[PDB]
Amino acid sequence: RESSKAAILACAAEYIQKLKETDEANIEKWTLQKLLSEQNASQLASANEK
Amino acid sequence: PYTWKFLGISKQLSLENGIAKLNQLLNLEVDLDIQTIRVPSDPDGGTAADEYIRYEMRLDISNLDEGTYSKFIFLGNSKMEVPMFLCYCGTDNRNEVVLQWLKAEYGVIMWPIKFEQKTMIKLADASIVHVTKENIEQITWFSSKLYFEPETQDKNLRQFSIEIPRESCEGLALGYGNTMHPYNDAIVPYIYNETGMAVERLPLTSVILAGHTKIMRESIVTSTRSLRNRVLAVVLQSIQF
Amino acid sequence: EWKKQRKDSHKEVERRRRENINTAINVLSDLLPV
Amino acid sequence: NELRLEDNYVPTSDTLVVFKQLMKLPVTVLYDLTLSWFAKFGGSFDGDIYLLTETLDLLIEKGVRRNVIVNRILYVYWPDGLNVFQLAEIDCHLMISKPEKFKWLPSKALRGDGKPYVVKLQPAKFIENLQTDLAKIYHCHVYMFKHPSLPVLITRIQLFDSNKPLISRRPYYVAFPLNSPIIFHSVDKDIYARLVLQSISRTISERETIIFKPVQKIPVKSIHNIMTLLGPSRFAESMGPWECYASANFERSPLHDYKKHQGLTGKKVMVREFDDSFLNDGKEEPEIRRLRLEKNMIKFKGSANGVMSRYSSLVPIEKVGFTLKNEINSRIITIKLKFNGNDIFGGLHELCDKNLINIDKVPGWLAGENGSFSGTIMNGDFQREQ
């Protein structure tokens, strides 16, 4: 909570930017983990079908 | 809001000649101001061409009566064709009595001041620029908007306006770089750059800054205490041939 | 007078404060998608 | 609930206001209405139809002034007052006579999430459901008439108040095109504007929820022009320089002869200077002058001849305000343009003829493309105002 309205608006802008950046980083790391899991599944399924 | 009436001078005159004999016709005291300063046309250096002389006085006793307040500000050169001009604000008998007294004294005759697009835009450049006590120039910016009133049949397009937020003004000058004339290189070309209209060719009615000045061709309006020096200098060159 | 100069300074400060809010809300409206 | 009004109720409308309504109508149409008026509700005249049409014909023979016949129909034939049906007739006939005096606003109908709903109005069923939905609250009387030269179905709705005769309010007009999700309605902001428009949405749906969304916020007059602007037509979404595609006259049929195909003949063109020579300026050749004047008309009218003096555009508009946003050096530069006048795009055309505005650098939106819509522009894409 802040008193001056300009500080309120600046903090709101910073909050929006921080939320977007955090969401993007989480998506990136989760996508990396997804890629690793998919690679493991494919490499096991290849031996299974062979 | 103070409206300024502009006016020119045919040949150079001397004004401090008889402040004692300028009062008995008017029946109250009038003071005198003698002042001259540097007006750097180029920051690197300045020749003798910027040598300017300025006079200033008033006709009043009552400081409470803010409405009945008028000032006559003089400034000009002595080596080019037109030596100087003059400006005043307010409507009263005091705005002309001295004016007749030098009507029949020096033989100089007056004429209304004409502004067109080649001059109107460049006035805001002198209005926004600031000077400190250490001779350091920094610019205080304002959200300028323009008024356009094109003459046409059927009145198909009778008035349209262009507004620029001056944070975008900040984003334009910085893109061009450090410039002493922001409206030469950041603003006026950019309107032609995007929309393709020539500001200067089109009939311009008014250039309005955000609460600092009010520029129109008929008369200049400013809410400041007194007009600055760069404004008068650029007006002088503009009315020069 | 001194009072007039103080009033002029107050007016300038008030104008700057008014313009700051407009600039901040313009930035915010820029950030919004709609 | 017998709160509905029949076609025989006589409201206590002032004699002066109805006097001014008959003022604007021509003489030849007053004769037509009077004959039809007596055949439906009769009148105070002590005679038959043949006797009435005889004396009325004689007023034409003598060149009788319209003030006499207007006073005759107000103080002799119907001294007591004017019927609601008669008021509706005079209103619709004034609508036909002077279509430029009435303004309209567009509105869109949506079903589900974002699927547009094309309206199919039954002239009968749309009446009784609206009457039932409106009479439960207020006295309601409606009248429908079809445009003589347009496919729209203009509906006028008037509401009465009890404050004993009923007091008439300002009528509300809603125009329904044949098959188009866009519905044009009049401008009103009263208790009756939100009661009539809301009732129409429930009535016309009859099976699923239908909501109304205002397409624009600036009304446009000339109901003829709004149909071309937003109604079902080829000219919608292809205005401005692209008006040549709306009327496919530049392309011949495949079965047509191939010598008249413009491939053999070609086109006459002039070279445009990509280097900026417009700022600095010699008398132009008359042929060069003609070609220069042709370039201006191509980018504002769409063709050398013009789809439509010469500066009048296809659809005149009053106020359009654009907003241009561009990204320079990782920051946004905003320029706001507001225009006002009678024909905005017609006015810009004349200024380009006087060499005030370069014709090469004007953008599409300034030339008339997607006209009557004002909104933000980014990355070369136009976004309408929300």
XYZ file of C-alpha atoms in Angstrom:
711
model
C 0.000 0.000 0.000
C 1.219 3.476 -0.947
C -0.161 6.993 -0.583
C 0.738 8.822 -3.804
C -1.258 7.763 -6.858
C 1.755 7.861 -9.189
C 3.531 5.322 -6.982
C 0.386 3.170 -7.090
C 0.352 3.191 -10.894
C 4.093 2.505 -11.141
C 3.807 -0.398 -8.694
C 0.876 -1.794 -10.688
C 2.935 -1.672 -13.890
C 5.881 -3.366 -12.175
C 3.527 -6.004 -10.747
C 2.130 -6.789 -14.203
C 5.621 -7.049 -15.690
C 6.854 -9.286 -12.859
C 3.848 -11.596 -13.180
C 4.360 -11.953 -16.933
C 8.091 -12.639 -16.535
C 7.514 -15.253 -13.822
C 4.885 -16.988 -15.954
C 7.237 -17.061 -18.948
C 10.101 -18.529 -16.907
C 7.845 -21.214 -15.426
C 6.571 -22.149 -18.893
C 10.139 -22.401 -20.197
C 11.390 -24.697 -17.434
C 8.263 -26.871 -17.578
C 8.686 -27.200 -21.352
C 12.283 -28.330 -20.827
C 11.133 -30.994 -18.360
C 8.436 -32.080 -20.834
C 11.083 -32.481 -23.538
C 13.225 -34.627 -21.239
C 10.273 -36.866 -20.336
C 9.273 -37.260 -23.992
C 12.836 -38.219 -24.921
C 12.902 -40.872 -22.190
C 9.551 -42.299 -23.295
C 10.626 -42.475 -26.944
C 13.982 -44.100 -26.192
C 12.310 -46.787 -24.084
C 9.536 -47.409 -26.632
C 12.122 -47.948 -29.381
C 13.672 -50.872 -27.499
C 10.196 -52.154 -26.633
C 9.137 -52.312 -30.287
C 12.479 -53.797 -31.373
C -4.093 34.144 -19.330
C -2.416 37.305 -20.650
C -2.836 38.292 -24.297
C 0.134 40.023 -25.945
C -0.279 42.540 -28.759
C 2.728 42.755 -31.081
C 3.958 45.747 -33.034
C 7.030 46.886 -34.951
C 9.322 49.918 -35.279
C 10.466 51.581 -38.508
C 13.760 53.136 -37.348
C 15.761 52.980 -34.132
C 14.609 55.414 -31.447
C 15.820 56.611 -28.052
C 13.312 56.136 -25.234
C 15.083 57.329 -22.068
C 15.019 60.855 -23.558
C 12.752 62.646 -21.112
C 11.167 60.365 -18.517
C 10.616 63.636 -16.642
C 8.678 65.013 -19.632
C 6.727 61.779 -20.219
C 4.907 62.053 -16.876
C 3.250 65.490 -16.697
C 1.080 64.537 -19.681
C 0.023 61.431 -17.737
C 0.123 62.794 -14.149
C 1.850 59.866 -12.428
C 5.351 58.459 -12.109
C 6.844 55.951 -14.560
C 10.131 54.154 -13.897
C 12.918 53.088 -16.270
C 14.790 49.854 -16.963
C 18.086 49.591 -18.857
C 19.136 46.042 -19.631
C 21.167 43.996 -22.114
C 22.274 40.350 -22.082
C 23.790 37.633 -24.261
C 21.515 35.787 -26.681
C 23.563 32.840 -28.005
C 22.395 32.015 -31.518
C 24.986 29.214 -31.534
C 26.204 27.626 -28.267
C 29.768 27.308 -29.584
C 30.131 31.064 -30.036
C 28.348 34.309 -30.726
C 29.261 37.261 -32.932
C 28.233 40.893 -32.403
C 24.943 40.241 -34.243
C 23.171 39.217 -31.012
C 23.844 42.573 -29.325
C 20.364 43.415 -28.014
C 18.988 46.328 -25.976
C 15.758 46.012 -23.999
C 13.545 48.573 -22.256
C 10.650 47.964 -19.863
C 8.307 50.123 -17.785
C 4.712 50.334 -16.579
C 1.930 52.836 -15.891
C 0.269 52.100 -12.553
C 0.158 52.804 -8.834
C -2.291 50.122 -7.682
C -0.844 46.637 -7.248
C -4.207 45.322 -6.017
C -5.800 46.066 -9.410
C -4.289 43.154 -11.316
C -6.709 43.628 -14.215
C -5.638 47.210 -14.971
C -1.997 46.202 -15.394
C 0.033 46.772 -18.555
C 3.678 46.523 -19.594
C 5.562 47.842 -22.629
C 8.553 45.636 -23.461
C 11.025 46.842 -26.091
C 13.896 44.940 -27.699
C 15.826 45.107 -30.939
C 19.020 45.710 -32.870
C 20.593 48.643 -34.711
C 22.413 47.169 -37.732
C 19.803 45.298 -39.761
C 16.899 46.881 -41.638
C 14.154 46.807 -38.989
C 15.759 47.913 -35.701
C 13.217 46.724 -33.141
C 9.590 45.928 -32.335
C 7.371 46.223 -29.271
C 4.718 44.290 -27.388
C 2.078 45.072 -24.788
C -0.795 43.444 -22.926
C -4.146 44.644 -21.640
C -6.653 47.245 -22.801
C -6.537 50.730 -21.280
C -5.869 54.354 -22.124
C -2.348 53.933 -20.711
C -1.584 51.521 -23.565
C -1.715 54.377 -26.100
C -1.142 57.803 -24.485
C 2.635 57.372 -24.557
C 2.077 55.816 -27.980
C 0.829 59.131 -29.397
C 3.562 60.977 -27.501
C 6.114 59.110 -29.629
C 3.731 59.152 -32.579
C 4.586 62.798 -33.185
C 8.081 62.726 -31.639
C 10.282 60.447 -33.766
C 8.309 59.957 -36.983
C 8.139 56.154 -36.727
C 4.881 54.583 -37.910
C 3.432 51.294 -36.717
C 2.056 48.192 -38.438
C 0.374 44.967 -37.260
C 2.618 41.910 -36.970
C 2.031 39.055 -39.421
C 2.797 35.410 -38.630
C 2.769 32.435 -40.985
C 3.802 28.790 -40.801
C 7.525 29.425 -41.388
C 7.572 31.267 -38.035
C 4.647 29.986 -35.972
C 6.056 26.538 -35.155
C 9.546 27.772 -34.251
C 8.201 30.008 -31.466
C 7.393 26.989 -29.285
C 11.055 25.951 -29.538
C 12.122 29.178 -27.838
C 9.259 28.816 -25.349
C 10.204 25.326 -24.153
C 13.961 25.908 -23.889
C 15.231 27.007 -20.473
C 18.398 28.630 -19.145
C 19.756 28.373 -15.604
C 22.028 30.662 -13.595
C 25.084 28.615 -14.660
C 24.456 29.077 -18.417
C 23.314 25.459 -18.802
C 20.550 24.758 -21.324
C 17.954 22.098 -20.530
C 14.530 21.714 -22.133
C 11.252 21.577 -20.222
C 8.840 19.665 -22.439
C 5.118 20.116 -23.054
C 2.407 18.075 -24.784
C 1.962 20.177 -27.912
C -1.181 20.038 -30.055
C -1.798 21.793 -33.363
C -4.927 23.423 -34.786
C -5.631 23.205 -38.523
C -8.442 25.101 -40.277
C -8.357 24.425 -44.030
C -10.398 26.639 -46.328
C -12.635 24.546 -48.571
C -15.947 24.502 -50.405
C -18.894 22.563 -48.929
C -16.933 22.837 -45.638
C -16.054 19.178 -46.166
C -13.033 19.459 -43.844
C -13.224 22.662 -41.811
C -11.047 21.894 -38.773
C -8.808 19.024 -37.681
C -6.150 18.651 -35.001
C -2.993 16.670 -34.249
C -2.059 15.852 -30.646
C 1.285 14.488 -29.451
C 1.921 13.211 -25.916
C 5.213 14.673 -24.928
C 6.626 11.445 -23.557
C 6.395 10.466 -27.222
C 8.019 13.850 -27.847
C 10.806 12.556 -25.595
C 10.985 9.346 -27.625
C 11.364 11.303 -30.870
C 14.168 13.728 -29.987
C 16.213 10.966 -28.344
C 15.908 8.884 -31.506
C 17.248 11.775 -33.567
C 19.822 12.650 -30.900
C 20.851 15.753 -29.001
C 19.297 18.604 -30.997
C 18.939 22.311 -30.239
C 15.848 22.538 -32.482
C 13.548 19.618 -31.539
C 10.780 20.670 -33.923
C 13.187 20.726 -36.870
C 14.274 17.107 -36.491
C 11.910 15.127 -34.240
C 8.356 16.424 -34.539
C 7.504 18.263 -37.757
C 9.179 15.751 -40.133
C 7.651 12.844 -38.205
C 4.129 14.062 -38.997
C 5.124 14.137 -42.669
C 7.050 10.903 -42.090
C 3.954 8.906 -41.094
C 0.789 10.652 -42.323
C 2.317 12.426 -45.329
C 0.879 15.884 -44.629
C 3.070 18.979 -44.778
C 2.401 21.063 -41.664
C 3.891 24.209 -43.182
C 1.972 24.114 -46.473
C -1.331 23.499 -44.682
C -3.027 26.500 -43.018
C -2.145 26.392 -39.319
C -4.377 28.198 -36.829
C -2.833 27.561 -33.410
C -0.006 25.728 -31.666
C -0.874 24.953 -28.043
C 1.542 23.814 -25.351
C 0.456 22.121 -22.135
C -0.364 25.032 -19.845
C 2.668 27.159 -20.753
C 1.813 29.168 -23.893
C -1.015 29.738 -26.365
C 0.233 30.602 -29.838
C -2.043 31.988 -32.526
C -1.174 34.122 -35.531
C -3.392 37.061 -34.536
C -1.834 37.347 -31.070
C 0.356 35.331 -28.707
C -1.081 34.331 -25.324
C 1.066 33.235 -22.391
C 0.271 32.636 -18.719
C 3.788 33.535 -17.566
C 4.743 36.608 -15.590
C 6.717 38.244 -18.435
C 7.916 37.175 -21.879
C 11.389 35.702 -22.339
C 14.305 36.809 -24.543
C 14.686 34.012 -27.110
C 11.032 34.472 -28.107
C 11.601 38.149 -28.890
C 14.805 37.404 -30.803
C 13.217 34.766 -33.040
C 10.269 37.099 -33.669
C 12.765 39.774 -34.716
C 14.528 37.533 -37.243
C 11.203 36.277 -38.603
C 9.889 39.766 -39.320
C 13.272 40.655 -40.829
C 13.417 40.308 -44.617
C 5.591 40.446 -4.516
C 6.812 37.507 -2.441
C 3.260 36.151 -2.197
C 2.899 36.269 -5.988
C 6.161 34.360 -6.473
C 5.065 31.760 -3.916
C 1.738 31.416 -5.740
C 3.523 30.965 -9.074
C 5.762 28.261 -7.602
C 2.715 26.527 -6.115
C 0.946 26.657 -9.484
C 3.970 25.166 -11.254
C 4.245 22.369 -8.679
C 0.523 21.628 -9.000
C 0.786 21.492 -12.797
C 3.739 19.099 -12.596
C 1.860 16.866 -10.150
C -1.186 16.865 -12.435
C 0.897 15.935 -15.484
C 2.711 13.119 -13.659
C -0.560 11.254 -13.045
C -1.498 11.597 -16.717
C 1.878 10.221 -17.814
C 1.624 7.285 -15.401
C -1.900 6.377 -16.496
C -0.843 6.668 -20.148
C 1.934 4.153 -19.465
C -0.553 1.875 -17.700
C -3.023 2.080 -20.597
C -0.139 1.216 -22.915
C 0.510 -1.913 -20.846
C -3.115 -3.089 -21.039
C -4.084 -5.471 -23.880
C -7.566 -3.975 -24.313
C -54.119 -7.048 -19.409
C -55.886 -4.792 -21.923
C -53.192 -2.106 -21.809
C -52.535 -2.264 -25.559
C -53.907 0.490 -27.791
C -56.146 -0.105 -30.795
C -56.039 1.880 -34.040
C -58.957 4.101 -32.959
C -57.593 5.758 -29.804
C -57.401 9.555 -29.947
C -54.573 11.028 -27.853
C -54.737 14.699 -26.902
C -51.878 15.787 -29.130
C -51.534 19.532 -29.612
C -53.027 21.037 -32.756
C -49.918 23.150 -33.383
C -47.406 20.282 -33.436
C -49.476 18.206 -35.867
C -49.981 21.406 -37.872
C -46.211 21.626 -38.381
C -45.990 17.950 -39.370
C -48.407 18.491 -42.267
C -46.413 21.650 -43.070
C -43.455 19.739 -44.511
C -45.410 17.233 -46.609
C -46.153 18.283 -50.214
C -49.630 19.001 -51.533
C -49.850 15.925 -53.769
C -49.313 13.522 -50.860
C -51.938 15.196 -48.651
C -54.634 14.287 -51.179
C -53.556 10.633 -51.195
C -53.590 10.234 -47.404
C -56.995 11.885 -46.958
C -58.673 9.465 -49.372
C -57.105 6.467 -47.628
C -57.833 7.863 -44.156
C -61.590 8.048 -44.746
C -61.718 4.516 -46.173
C -60.423 3.057 -42.882
C -61.801 5.096 -39.962
C -64.175 7.491 -41.700
C -64.510 11.059 -40.524
C -66.851 13.832 -39.474
C -67.625 14.769 -43.092
C -71.320 14.251 -43.886
C -70.881 12.440 -47.178
C -69.763 9.299 -48.948
C -66.397 8.470 -50.509
C -67.522 9.793 -53.899
C -68.662 13.091 -52.377
C -65.389 13.422 -50.455
C -63.169 12.662 -53.456
C -65.186 15.170 -55.505
C -64.688 18.212 -53.268
C -61.064 17.260 -52.586
C -60.448 17.039 -56.338
C -61.861 20.558 -56.680
C -59.342 21.962 -54.198
C -56.689 20.746 -56.642
C -58.570 22.314 -59.564
C -58.644 25.779 -57.973
C -55.018 25.609 -56.843
C -56.162 25.922 -53.233
C -53.418 26.882 -50.791
C -52.177 24.068 -48.569
C -52.937 26.047 -45.403
C -56.634 25.846 -46.297
C -56.633 22.071 -46.783
C -54.422 21.520 -43.722
C -56.898 23.538 -41.666
C -59.695 21.621 -43.409
C -58.381 18.229 -42.280
C -57.654 19.553 -38.767
C -60.752 21.684 -38.098
C -63.462 20.262 -40.393
C -62.803 16.609 -41.203
C -61.257 15.677 -37.824
C -61.753 18.600 -35.416
C -61.602 16.336 -32.353
C -58.072 15.052 -32.908
C -55.748 12.792 -34.863
C -55.631 9.004 -34.757
C -52.517 7.060 -33.789
C -52.556 5.329 -37.176
C -52.774 8.715 -38.907
C -49.826 9.959 -36.845
C -47.839 6.867 -37.825
C -48.691 7.449 -41.493
C -47.596 11.087 -41.425
C -44.408 10.120 -39.577
C -43.473 7.419 -42.093
C -44.305 9.672 -45.045
C -42.082 12.384 -43.562
C -39.407 9.704 -43.147
C -39.617 8.839 -46.847
C -39.688 12.479 -47.975
C -36.665 13.625 -45.914
C -34.362 10.668 -45.186
C -31.395 12.960 -44.429
C -32.981 14.437 -41.279
C -32.881 11.227 -39.196
C -29.815 9.675 -37.560
C -29.186 5.977 -36.959
C -26.867 3.850 -34.837
C -25.660 0.321 -35.643
C -25.962 -2.677 -33.351
C -24.915 -6.312 -33.699
C -26.735 -9.464 -32.580
C -24.708 -12.322 -31.095
C -25.666 -15.876 -30.141
C -23.557 -18.206 -28.040
C -19.971 -17.096 -27.522
C -19.061 -15.222 -30.699
C -21.271 -16.575 -33.473
C -23.181 -13.779 -35.257
C -26.936 -14.342 -35.490
C -28.611 -13.332 -38.748
C -32.111 -12.004 -38.096
C -35.173 -13.447 -39.843
C -38.111 -11.206 -38.937
C -41.666 -12.432 -39.434
C -43.923 -9.377 -39.941
C -46.695 -10.999 -37.874
C -44.986 -12.981 -35.100
C -42.600 -10.136 -34.232
C -45.582 -7.904 -33.399
C -47.639 -9.859 -30.860
C -44.654 -11.071 -28.823
C -43.376 -7.494 -28.534
C -46.868 -6.327 -27.555
C -47.064 -8.987 -24.840
C -43.581 -8.175 -23.532
C -44.261 -4.418 -23.474
C -47.891 -4.122 -22.314
C -47.146 -5.938 -19.050
C -45.383 -2.687 -18.087
C -46.505 0.241 -20.277
C -49.063 1.085 -22.939
C -47.646 0.076 -26.315
C -48.516 0.728 -29.959
C -46.389 -0.365 -32.919
C -46.466 0.148 -36.678
C -44.447 -1.513 -39.450
C -43.778 -0.247 -42.965
C -41.396 -1.388 -45.697
C -39.041 0.998 -47.468
C -40.226 1.606 -51.061
C -36.730 1.379 -52.584
C -34.753 -0.397 -49.844
C -34.989 -3.929 -48.409
C -35.169 -2.691 -44.801
C -38.253 -2.990 -42.586
C -38.533 0.169 -40.482
C -40.488 -0.284 -37.244
C -41.670 2.628 -35.104
C -42.591 2.127 -31.448
C -44.365 4.791 -29.388
C -45.031 4.614 -25.651
C -47.833 6.348 -23.749
C -47.939 7.656 -20.176
C -50.747 8.342 -17.712
C -50.262 11.545 -15.719
C -57.729 10.662 -18.728
C -56.017 10.810 -22.124
C -52.618 9.232 -22.675
C -49.530 11.375 -23.285
C -47.370 10.359 -26.241
C -43.591 10.128 -25.911
C -40.833 10.380 -28.502
C -41.083 7.444 -30.940
C -38.296 4.878 -31.206
C -37.314 3.644 -34.676
C -35.648 0.270 -35.263
C -34.702 -0.708 -38.821
C -34.324 -4.391 -39.708
C -32.436 -5.361 -42.879
C -33.539 -8.551 -44.604
C -30.681 -10.880 -43.589
C -27.880 -9.208 -41.635
C -26.669 -9.468 -38.020
C -26.413 -5.660 -37.926
C -29.550 -3.872 -36.703
C -29.919 -0.096 -37.029
C -31.862 1.717 -34.312
C -32.494 5.353 -33.460
C -30.674 7.361 -30.785
C -32.276 7.585 -27.342
C -31.048 7.404 -23.739
C -34.293 7.456 -21.742
C -36.309 4.952 -19.723
C -37.895 3.825 -22.988
C -34.683 3.312 -24.967
C -33.488 0.501 -22.700
C -37.008 -0.950 -22.408
C -37.720 -1.159 -26.147
C -34.316 -2.387 -27.328
C -34.151 -5.040 -24.600
C -37.648 -6.313 -25.424
C -36.745 -6.714 -29.110
C -33.810 -9.014 -28.318
C -36.001 -11.390 -26.303
C -38.777 -11.329 -28.915
C -36.701 -12.017 -32.034
C -34.726 -14.887 -30.467
C -37.504 -17.233 -29.266
C -35.106 -20.160 -28.737
C -31.711 -18.938 -27.439
C -30.215 -15.956 -25.655
C -29.386 -13.015 -27.932
C -27.369 -9.980 -26.836
C -26.950 -6.655 -28.628
C -23.548 -5.001 -28.999
C -23.145 -1.420 -30.307
C -20.836 -1.483 -33.321
C -20.254 2.289 -33.359
C -20.728 5.247 -31.031
C -21.089 8.087 -33.583
C -24.507 8.152 -35.303
C -24.818 8.613 -39.059
C -27.843 10.056 -40.857
C -29.160 9.139 -44.327
C -30.566 5.630 -43.797
C -29.741 5.084 -47.471
C -26.048 5.651 -46.731
C -25.894 3.481 -43.602
C -27.138 0.472 -45.588
C -24.195 0.764 -47.976
C -21.864 1.501 -45.057
C -22.775 -1.404 -42.759
C -25.724 -3.340 -44.194
C -25.603 -6.395 -46.427
C -23.861 -5.254 -49.609
C -20.723 -5.807 -51.656
C -19.370 -2.360 -50.758
C -18.904 -3.292 -47.097
C -15.310 -4.198 -46.154
C -14.092 -2.996 -49.581
C -14.326 0.792 -49.299
C -11.790 3.468 -50.181
C -9.222 2.593 -52.843
C -10.610 -0.968 -52.961
C -14.032 0.146 -54.233
C -13.145 -1.231 -57.675
C -13.436 -4.760 -56.263
C -16.955 -4.124 -54.935
C -18.252 -3.608 -58.492
C -16.330 -6.102 -60.639
C -16.228 -3.953 -63.766
C -12.475 -4.167 -64.434
C -12.632 -7.931 -65.096
C -14.604 -9.587 -67.889
C -16.327 -12.958 -67.876
C -14.269 -15.984 -68.986
C -16.822 -16.587 -71.755
C -16.448 -12.971 -72.918
C -14.341 -11.967 -75.908
C -10.599 -11.831 -75.275
C -9.633 -8.947 -77.573
C -11.420 -6.511 -75.259
C -9.352 -8.027 -72.444
C -7.166 -5.220 -71.095
C -4.048 -7.391 -71.359
C -3.673 -6.451 -75.026
C -4.582 -2.779 -74.595
C -2.680 -2.243 -71.354
C -2.884 0.798 -69.111
C -1.431 4.310 -69.236
C 0.744 5.072 -66.205
C 3.276 7.630 -65.003
C 6.494 7.146 -63.053
C 6.345 8.164 -59.391
C 9.548 9.500 -57.842
C 10.609 7.412 -54.854
C 13.194 10.060 -53.955
C 11.647 12.900 -51.958
C 11.169 15.750 -54.438
C 7.842 16.944 -52.995
C 9.332 19.309 -50.399
C 11.231 21.454 -52.921
C 9.942 22.919 -56.180
C 8.642 25.149 -63.537
C 5.186 24.623 -65.033
C 3.821 21.109 -65.460
C 2.723 19.841 -68.851
C -1.080 19.666 -69.242
C -0.766 15.929 -69.895
C 1.387 15.575 -66.775
C -1.151 17.758 -64.963
C -3.974 15.429 -66.016
C -2.088 12.325 -64.870
C -1.199 13.965 -61.550
C -4.871 14.780 -60.967
C -5.776 11.184 -61.842
C -3.496 9.783 -59.129
C -5.396 11.664 -56.418
C -8.761 10.289 -57.545
C -7.498 6.694 -57.752
C -6.443 6.605 -54.094
C -9.699 8.290 -52.774
C -12.376 7.006 -55.181
C -10.833 3.696 -56.275
C -10.955 4.271 -60.037
C -10.074 6.873 -62.646
C -13.743 7.499 -63.450
C -14.910 7.195 -59.841
C -17.443 4.756 -58.401
C -19.837 7.619 -57.626
C -19.118 17.632 -57.633
C -16.102 15.405 -58.254
C -14.920 15.782 -54.643
C -18.026 14.151 -53.146
C -17.291 10.611 -51.982
C -19.556 7.557 -52.037
C -20.550 7.901 -48.368
C -19.924 11.185 -46.515
C -18.908 10.938 -42.863
C -18.761 13.602 -40.164
C -16.213 12.748 -37.453
C -13.393 10.192 -37.535
C -10.554 10.098 -35.019
C -7.496 7.919 -35.594
C -4.683 6.941 -33.234
C -1.274 5.889 -34.565
C 1.164 3.971 -32.356
C 4.641 2.925 -33.488
C 7.670 1.477 -31.712
C 10.922 3.424 -32.128
C 14.027 2.610 -30.059
C 12.133 0.291 -27.690
C 9.454 2.855 -26.830
C 6.000 3.696 -28.164
C 5.307 6.936 -30.045
C 1.637 7.945 -30.110
C 0.029 10.445 -32.492
C -3.693 11.220 -32.283
C -5.578 12.675 -35.257
C -9.126 14.035 -35.021
C -11.117 15.165 -38.060
C -14.391 17.077 -38.243
C -16.460 18.269 -41.179
C -19.098 17.277 -43.715
C -17.081 14.897 -45.932
C -13.739 14.090 -44.311
C -12.295 11.981 -47.122
C -13.688 14.368 -49.720
C -11.891 17.231 -48.002
C -8.555 15.412 -47.936
C -8.897 14.821 -51.684
C -9.064 18.547 -52.451
C -5.988 19.336 -50.348
C -4.035 16.727 -52.313
C -5.121 18.477 -55.517
C -3.618 21.757 -54.266
C -0.268 19.987 -53.655
C -0.554 20.583 -49.898
C -0.369 16.854 -49.051
C 1.886 14.335 -50.769
C -0.271 11.686 -52.424
C 2.422 8.986 -52.345
C 2.872 8.895 -48.557
C -0.754 9.009 -47.376
C -1.665 5.695 -45.694
C -4.641 3.484 -46.434
C -6.704 4.497 -43.409
C -6.325 8.197 -44.229
C -7.365 7.533 -47.846
C -10.804 6.182 -46.925
C -10.138 2.504 -46.274
C -12.415 0.989 -43.591
C -14.167 4.332 -43.349
C -16.541 5.471 -40.602
C -14.503 3.334 -38.163
C -12.042 5.049 -35.817
C -9.470 3.100 -33.843
C -5.848 2.417 -33.022
C -3.374 1.384 -35.734
C -0.302 -0.763 -35.055
C 2.125 -2.701 -37.252
C 0.075 -1.741 -40.296
C -3.069 -3.330 -38.824
C -6.242 -1.393 -38.016
C -8.084 -2.136 -34.765
C -11.579 -0.799 -34.166
C -12.419 1.124 -31.007
C -13.863 -1.041 -28.235
